[PDB]
Amino acid sequence: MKHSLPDLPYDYGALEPHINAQIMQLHHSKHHAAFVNNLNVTEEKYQEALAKGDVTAQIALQPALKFNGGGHINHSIFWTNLSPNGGGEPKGELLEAIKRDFGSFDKFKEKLTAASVGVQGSGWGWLGFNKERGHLQIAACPNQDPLQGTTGLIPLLGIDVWEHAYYLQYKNVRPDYLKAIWNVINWENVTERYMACKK
């Protein structure tokens, strides 16, 4: 009934030196925790407004619902997209799809990096699956706007480019963070999400 903060699947320092433990602890225990609690508060308000047929109240709650709900959706995926066992390249059908849709794994990395570096302000870069077209697709999302809820694409790999995802360690140089994060991508998880899209 109530959304809950998932435990991080590894130690706060498991991704060093690529993402330091201070970032991981703040990002999970402060940023994500606030989204979950605030999401539950917003949902309860929305349920009351819906039962009363208060459309003005429903609409006034939309920014908080998308922001906190998206924050919960995005970070819950993000933690599983990273791993101390990550990095390198995927294999199997996901690697084949990457080569087919983007030319090569390196070209895909460049395209997702470009989308992630190109976010002006806060947001996310995504590798997604387009169910209707049956192929991979890159998109960027502002703030906490979640991929599937706002575009219909199924999320496979998300790169958080909010400043809190990198600033303590990499300061203003977002490209240094993007270079580092490729070393911890949990391709086992991305592959699982991809295979779940195909039937």
Shortest distance (Å) from residue 150 CB to a second copy: 7
Among a second copy, K ion, Mn ion, none, partner that 160 touches (CB below 5 to 8 angstroms by kind): Mn ion
Residue 153's region, left for phi above 0, alpha for psi from -120 to 50, else beta, is beta
Breaks (C-N over 2.5 A) in the chain follow: none
75 known ligand binder: yes
x/- binding map, residues 40-79, to a second copy, per CB under 8 A? ---x--xx--xxxx-xxxxxx-x--xx--xx-xx------
Which range touches K ion (CB under 5 A), out of 15-23, 24-32, 129-137, 159-167?
Answer: 15-23
Burial (CB count within 10 angstroms: exposed 0-12, middle 13-18, buried 19+), residue 74:
buried
Q: Applying CB under 5 A, which of residues 46, 160, 174, 194 lies at the interface with Mn ion?
A: 160
| Binding of a second copy by 128 (CB under 8 A) | no
CB 159 within 8 A of CB 175: no
- Euclidean distance between CA atoms 143 and 123, whole angstroms: 4
Closer to Mn ion by Cβ: residue 6 or 130:
6
Terminal-residue alpha carbon distance, the chain: 29
Among 3, 5, 6, 13, binds K ion (CB under 5 A): 13
Binding site for a second copy (CB under 8 A): 1-3, 39, 43, 46-47, 50-53, 55-60, 62, 65-66, 69-70, 72-73, 145-146, 148-150, 152
**Per the annotation, where are the binding residues for Mn(2+)?**
27, 75, 160, 164
Binding site for Mn ion (CB under 5 A): 160, 162
